[PDB]
């Protein structure tokens, strides 16, 4: 079923980026059977949900769904409450907390606002996990915007131990929304995604969370530079060849 | 989901294909769908449908220029209407080919005006878009005799992974001794060299105009265009200009108000 892999994906990458989770259910009704591998291979944008227990936001995502339910990233549950939700290890419980910390401060910073999310889960040979960041606009102003970031690390942690290999995958979609009486509506939404590996020490000086944080820190500054470059260059370029 | 849903969501698709993407988008519907007599019933509605929403231009063997295929221009039964060349010809919405021009009249109480306005709309067309075509019709719709004029203007670069489309729709309704004008101005832009990213744009626009002659009015027509085109062009840019120094910024920082990268030992801490 390769071939309908394929056209689902390159479909994917010529709809309009503004109808994605819509255009993502349509495609699986078209082909039920590439719905694993759909829901696997392509990013939807990310919705907020409340922990009524902590007062905090948090974000969804296939990542932390289990069934029809998600887990929260500040109490350790599912909402709806499951019979046995997918939950990480102590181990891996106490560096999520640290990890979903670290990224709030690190939000707090680059960001000035918005929600972050950390979902980690363990593997045979190490761990992975998502960190994900949902900035959006004053929608008082004429001008709308969302950001959503979905930076998926995967570690490899090599026996012994004080080193691992990261492999990085970032998405960032980025849409914007304008309604001037001189423009009229101004519709700029898609998506870059950028991957990367690299092997690191693990020590005291240099723990896993540092680690990623570098690595989504260098990646997240270069995809804004990138698409700093395609929405409002290229675009704009290609608008005035037009007239 | 039932055949019927299924060709629902593939006739949506193809009707939704970027400028400049129409056979990517109809193989890749075509491959998933699966079902090639199904698609030919469900979704031939969308092929005709897609090429009138993008006004496409079309060569024409023996005519010089391009003609658009819209709504206005719609015949019934496979033929659209060059209301400049006065004759009609079948279009093939899947090849995007014109063949069998036949001699062909319809409205002839605005012939004059439909003439004045095409031949002031052309000049200012060539000279405005790169390569812009235009089509301009004449006819009386729930009672009233309208000029309706279509400009089109598009940049296929598919070695570069990129398409734009200008399209504008000018209707001018004569109740003399004044014209009500009703436009809408629509861009869209893909660009995914590196990953989708679109631009969907459009505009309304009313304005009223004062009729005299085919001549004079055909001229004031254009003016009204020339200026609602260009402000919409001008206002384009300054909001790009407002989205990529404020908005953007407002989303996401360059950096943190520190001026440096994280130091991740104070974070941690
Ligand atoms: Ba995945």
């Not at chain 1, 993502?24 to 082909?31: A, C, N, T, W």
């Not at chain 2, 294909?17 to 075509?30: H, M, Y």
């Not at chain 2, 231009?57 to 221009?73: C, F």
């Given at each position: 079923?390769?071939?309908?892999?394929?056209?689902?994906?390159?479909?994917?990458?010529?709809?309009?980026?503004?109808?994605?989770?819509?255009?993502?259910?349509?495609?699986?009704?078209?082909?039920?059977?590439?719905?694993?591998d759909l829901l696997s291979s392509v990013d939807?944008?990310?919705?907020?949900?409340?922990?009524?227990?902590?007062?905090?936001?948090?974000?969804?995502?296939?990542?932390?769904?289990?069934?029809?339910?998600?887990?929260?990233?500040?109490?350790?549950?599912?909402?709806?409450?499951?019979?046995?939700?997918?939950?990480?290890?102590?181990?891996?419980?106490?560096?999520?907390?640290?990890?979903?910390?670290?990224?709030?401060?690190?939000?707090?910073?680059?960001?000035?606002?918005?929600?972050?999310?950390?979902?980690?889960?363990?593997?045979?040979?190490?761990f992975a996990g998502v960190i994900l960041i949902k900035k959006a606009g004053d929608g008082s102003k004429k001008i709308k915007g969302c950001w959503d970031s979905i930076h998926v690390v995967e570690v490899q942690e090599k026996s012994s131990g004080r080193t691992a290999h990261y492999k990085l995958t970032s998405t960032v979609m980025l849409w914007l929304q304008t309604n001037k009486t001189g423009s009229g509506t101004m519709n700029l939404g898609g998506s870059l995604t950028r991957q990367m590996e690299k092997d690191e020490t693990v020590?005291?000086?240099?723990?896993?969370?540092?680690?990623?944080?570098?690595?989504?820190?260098?990646?997240?500054?270069?995809?804004?530079?990138?698409?700093?470059?395609?929405?409002?260059?290229?675009?704009?370029?290609?608008?005035?060849?037009?007239? | 989901v039932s055949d019927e849903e299924k060709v629902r969501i593939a006739a949506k698709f193809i009707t939704h294909?970027?400028?400049?993407?129409?056979?990517?988008?109809?193989?890749?519907?075509?491959l998933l769908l699966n079902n090639d007599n199904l698609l030919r019933e469900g979704?031939?509605?969308?092929?005709?449908?897609?090429?009138?929403?993008?006004?496409?231009?079309?060569?024409?063997?023996?005519?010089?220029?391009?003609?658009?295929?819209?709504?206005?221009?719609?015949?019934?039964?496979?033929?659209?209407l060059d209301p400049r060349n006065k004759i009609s010809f079948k279009f093939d919405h899947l090849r995007k080919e014109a063949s069998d021009p036949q001699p062909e009249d319809t409205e002839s109480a605005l012939k004059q005006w439909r003439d004045a306005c095409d031949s002031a709309l052309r000049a200012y067309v060539k000279?405005?878009?790169?390569?812009?075509?235009?089509?301009?019709?004449?006819?009386?719709?729930?009672?009233?005799?309208?000029?309706?004029?279509?400009?089109?203007?598009?940049?296929?670069?598919?070695?570069?992974?990129?398409?734009?489309?200008?399209?504008?729709?000018?209707?001018?309704?004569?109740?003399?001794?004044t014209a009500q004008v009703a436009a809408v101005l629509k861009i869209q832009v893909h660009y995914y060299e590196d990953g989708n990213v679109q631009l969907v744009s459009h505009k309304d626009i009313q304005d009223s105009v004062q009729v005299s002659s085919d001549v004079q009015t055909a001229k004031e027509f254009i003016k009204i265009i020339e200026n609602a085109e260009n402000e919409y062009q001008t206002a384009i840019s300054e909001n790009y200009q407002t989205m990529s120094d404020t908005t953007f910024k407002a989303l996401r920082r360059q950096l943190p108000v520190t001026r440096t990268k994280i130091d991740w030992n104070k974070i941690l801490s």
């Open positions: 079923s390769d071939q309908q892999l394929d056209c689902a994906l390159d479909l994917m990458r010529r709809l309009p980026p503004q109808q994605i989770e819509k255009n993502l259910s349509d495609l699986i009704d078209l082909v039920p059977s590439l719905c694993e939807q944008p990310l919705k907020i949900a409340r922990d009524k227990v902590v007062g905090k936001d948090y974000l969804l995502c296939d990542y932390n769904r289990d069934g029809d339910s998600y887990r929260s990233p500040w109490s350790n549950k599912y909402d709806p409450p499951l019979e046995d939700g997918a939950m990480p290890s102590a181990r891996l419980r106490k560096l999520e907390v640290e990890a979903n910390n670290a990224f709030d401060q690190y939000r707090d910073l680059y960001f000035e606002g918005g929600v972050s999310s950390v979902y980690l889960w363990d593997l045979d040979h190490g020590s005291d000086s240099s723990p896993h969370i540092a680690n990623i944080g570098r690595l989504v820190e260098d990646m997240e500054n270069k995809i804004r530079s990138t698409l700093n470059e395609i929405y409002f260059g290229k675009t704009k370029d290609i608008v005035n060849g037009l007239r | 294909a970027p400028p400049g993407e129409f056979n990517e988008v109809f193989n890749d519907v075509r979704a031939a509605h969308a092929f005709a449908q897609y090429n009138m929403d993008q006004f496409t231009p079309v060569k024409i063997e023996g005519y010089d220029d391009q003609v658009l295929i819209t709504e206005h221009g719609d015949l019934g039964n496979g033929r659209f000279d405005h878009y790169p390569n812009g075509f235009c089509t301009v019709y004449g006819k009386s719709i729930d009672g009233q005799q309208t000029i309706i004029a279509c400009i089109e203007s598009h940049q296929f670069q598919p070695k570069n992974f990129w398409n734009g489309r200008w399209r504008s729709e000018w209707k001018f309704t004569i109740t003399p001794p």
